[PDB]
Amino acid sequence: MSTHYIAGQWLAGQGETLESLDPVGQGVVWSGRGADATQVDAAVCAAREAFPAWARRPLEQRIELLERFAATLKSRADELARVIGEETGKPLWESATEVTSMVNKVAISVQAFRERTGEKSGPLADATAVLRHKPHGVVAVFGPYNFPGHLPNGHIVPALLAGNCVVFKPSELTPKVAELTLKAWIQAGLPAGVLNLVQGGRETGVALAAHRGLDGLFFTGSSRTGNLLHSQFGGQPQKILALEMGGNNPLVVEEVADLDAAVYTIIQSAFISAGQRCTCARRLLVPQGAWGDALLARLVAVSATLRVGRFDEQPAPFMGAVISLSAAEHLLKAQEHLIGKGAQPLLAMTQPIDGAALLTPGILDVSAVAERPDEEFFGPLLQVIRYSDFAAAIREANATQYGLAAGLLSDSRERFEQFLVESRAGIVNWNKQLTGAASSAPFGGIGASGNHRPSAYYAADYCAYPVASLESPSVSLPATLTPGI
Amino acid sequence: MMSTHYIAGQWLAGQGETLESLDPVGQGVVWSGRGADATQVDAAVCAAREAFPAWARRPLEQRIELLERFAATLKSRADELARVIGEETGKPLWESATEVTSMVNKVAISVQAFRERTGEKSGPLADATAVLRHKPHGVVAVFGPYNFPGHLPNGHIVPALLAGNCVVFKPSELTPKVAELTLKAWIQAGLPAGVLNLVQGGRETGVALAAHRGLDGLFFTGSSRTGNLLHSQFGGQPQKILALEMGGNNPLVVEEVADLDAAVYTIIQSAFISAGQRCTCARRLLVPQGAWGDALLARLVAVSATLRVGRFDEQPAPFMGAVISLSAAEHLLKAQEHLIGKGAQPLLAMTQPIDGAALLTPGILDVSAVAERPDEEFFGPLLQVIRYSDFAAAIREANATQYGLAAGLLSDSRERFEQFLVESRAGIVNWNKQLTGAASSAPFGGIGASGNHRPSAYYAADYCAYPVASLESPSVSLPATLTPGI
Ligand SMILES: NC(=O)c1ccc[n+]([C@@H]2O[C@H](COP(=O)([O-])OP(=O)(O)OC[C@H]3O[C@@H](n4cnc5c(N)ncnc54)[C@H](O)[C@@H]3O)[C@@H](O)[C@H]2O)c1
Ligand SMILES: NC(=O)c1ccc[n+]([C@@H]2O[C@H](COP(=O)([O-])OP(=O)(O)OC[C@H]3O[C@@H](n4cnc5c(N)ncnc54)[C@H](O)[C@@H]3O)[C@@H](O)[C@H]2O)c1
Ligand SMILES: [Cl-]
Ligand SMILES: [Cl-]
Ligand SMILES: [Mg+2]
């Protein structure tokens, strides 16, 4: 019954029933009716009504509320980790780190706001030049399922900080996490209408994206969906759109002295979250020859031993299920399809429990595949390409329309310096796993992975617009008038 | 002799349609050439592409030295450049000289903005070093306007080259001579072949360039109509960065103030400087109902009728010159006629005193009684007046527009300005200062239909480079504690 949160109260949905299912055992974890078009309009109108007072209040009051939210999350951390685990399959240790990221987002967002969208004042001739930044108004946040708390939070926190009001539409796959996140905001004192939650599937998302009352839409999800949204907004520059989309991220591994360290780094890059982070390594470039062979064989051996299991299983698993049976089925077909085109399974991905979305890591050598898809496979399926020399590695790493992350494992600083020069990505690491980018830095992909509105530290930039003012306490005549007067 | 396109370090004659620019008063040919056809546009994009890796590789300090030599070259040729701006746009020499000074000054401010907004930071994070760098996109097109034919394109070109992009510049077909001389200065400054390319032309050329798949970015200043078409064209192509600086319908609210003379002067500078062709010019003057407001307007009309309007090099110097073409003048006069037809009252009718010349005298029209007032930008010296009942009505009317570039308040009350800031919806919001002449040291971007949330001037840096976040360690290593399950 308490499905949507609009204008400061909960209400039942009137649209299609939505259920989220435990990815392993398939039990219903949450259900409710989606928001119909009417309820979506109510959510936008609620944000609209709340906006003037929220925008008008002192910044420090908005900061206090965001700080109370982080403190409330912290106090409910175990409960939220458990819900994230229940719904996404993520092991408890990993879900806990997601909650920690949500808590930490507040202080970092405050720092970024003062730096990127703060207030400055200075003399300019006879007058005073002031710079301020102001919120857009009502913004929709579309959440993904992979970090169902942290990634929407990475839009919601800086948006509310700047003085916008938000309508949050979570992934239909992770509604329970969103519900609990709203409960933390509510417990923290958030004013009615400042943040509104509309749950639902396609129809709800479509109605919100189409709503003319939005001043902005902040999105994390697939490049397919984000491109649709971008096309939809073509010719409407008045509405700010921030698109954080997927990638096809290469990890280049030169022969390095500490081979086990490299193998561990590859696993953390490719298979953490069962390969469901935006930044996971999708293609592993490994040089031809004996060392490369040893690297791969060790990777395959260690990856085969990785614990895959239930979120709350003990001993704790390294990774959990993919988000649904549908997603697992789709990945197994991608593996089958590639193998059909000549890919060699160095370690074949399997589904060890019938009717559960658990998948074991996959490592496929696609060196011999003629035409390789420039496609993002959102799961633990790592493609390997063997390369002849470093220039060919760089060429291959760049052979994608995407541009989120890239990385080099190499003992050579000179080699990394070249890699930086030739890379085409928002995140470029040296000897560190591709995953776990810190909120203290901007996070945005280029090419098909974004629309030049990087999030994380730079989220501030799309949450407020600059207002430049020249101010003087009275009109006055200049000492010398312009000619002709 | 003519100099038409500059591509890969060489001057080339055009293969497209003939293009002439005409002195807006005398109608004499100021510049003439053939536009760049599609194959020449492709050559220019390819030239930028070929030059990009080396230019982007270069140490920042070497790009800075070129930009500084360029500024110094503009300074040495300042008189020459002011007279060409005057010739082509009609703008008085005194005002043209200020445009050249803004061009020179853009370099040092862009370097400051680059280090602030798109610089490099490095520090420890866990057992690694977190480094932030910014990289250029690649090849960017710059579409120039006619109103500031040197300063506004320079405001995209300088920060774009500084960040390491290479550029294809398509100037307004109304101001090609200004762009030619600007390129001659870049060339004299030592610009490397292909780093900045110039394709002159009309719509044929602009359409070919905007469509070219080789662009990584397109930076535009011009009308909302044209910018919206570009935005539509790029829908579904988020990989190409678009920065759109469009026009506005800017309101200036005037409360009763003690210094009536200063108020009138400030309004004139806001509405009629550059013959009303700055994108920040006041388009709507909001004046309180009642005797004081009637007096303000009576004075404004009397003073506006005496403003000197004339040729760019006339002496005594005119306050303002012609609008950009006879066609533009025609369009503005028709707009005035249409509005009066619908009930607007001519407090001061705009006139075209010399047949065959695009000189227009200032217009002030009371549109209060006009039913459905167009939310339209009239790019010329035609000021619309709306009389309001109370301050809340003034704010409502100020905000009754799809645009959002500039807004201002003349008022002796700081409290009224504070409220005005709270309720304003514009990127430039001034108190007791003319709406025109914004600082390069601050961001310059309109909201609503006036931009796409990519402000230029100080924040141009933001769209000229993308951040690259790096975590770095001299070698791979194992954590003291492995993740579970391994
Ligand atoms: N660059 C980044 O920051 C980043 C970060 C994390 C994840 N991702 C990504 O997220 C992905 C998968 O997660 P996902 O499945 O939730 O992405 P998604 O595209 O499926 O969905 C994200 C969201 O947009 C919506 N949506 C779905 N269909 C819609 C439609 N037809 N019309 C309008 N809205 C619609 C949702 O319901 C929702 O809240 C990737 O492809 C991936 O790499 C990107
Ligand atoms: N926000 C800003 O900073 C700002 C500042 C000053 C002026 N302006 C503005 O500039 C305007 C007028 O100048 P303008 O006449 O050059 O505007 P414009 O749209 O006609 O021209 C600007 C440019 O884009 C091009 N172009 C024109 N038609 C095109 C087409 N059909 N397809 C592709 N490209 C095309 C040009 O040829 C050119 O270089 C305004 O409406 C105005 O307020 C904006
Ligand atoms: Cl080295
Ligand atoms: Cl991450
Ligand atoms: Mg309670």
Swiss-Prot record, chain A:
It comes from the Bacteria. It is an enzyme of class 1 (oxidoreductase). NAD(+) binds at residues 221-226. Its EC number is 1.2.1.71. One of its GO terms (molecular function) is succinylglutamate-semialdehyde dehydrogenase activity. Induction: By arginine, under the control of ArgR. The active site is at 244, 278. Pathway: Amino-acid degradation; L-arginine degradation via AST pathway; L-glutamate and succinate from L-arginine: step 4/5. Belongs to the aldehyde dehydrogenase family. AstD subfamily. This is N-succinylglutamate 5-semialdehyde dehydrogenase. It comes from Pseudomonas aeruginosa (strain ATCC 15692 / DSM 22644 / CIP 104116 / JCM 14847 / LMG 12228 / 1C / PRS 101 / PAO1). The gene is astD.
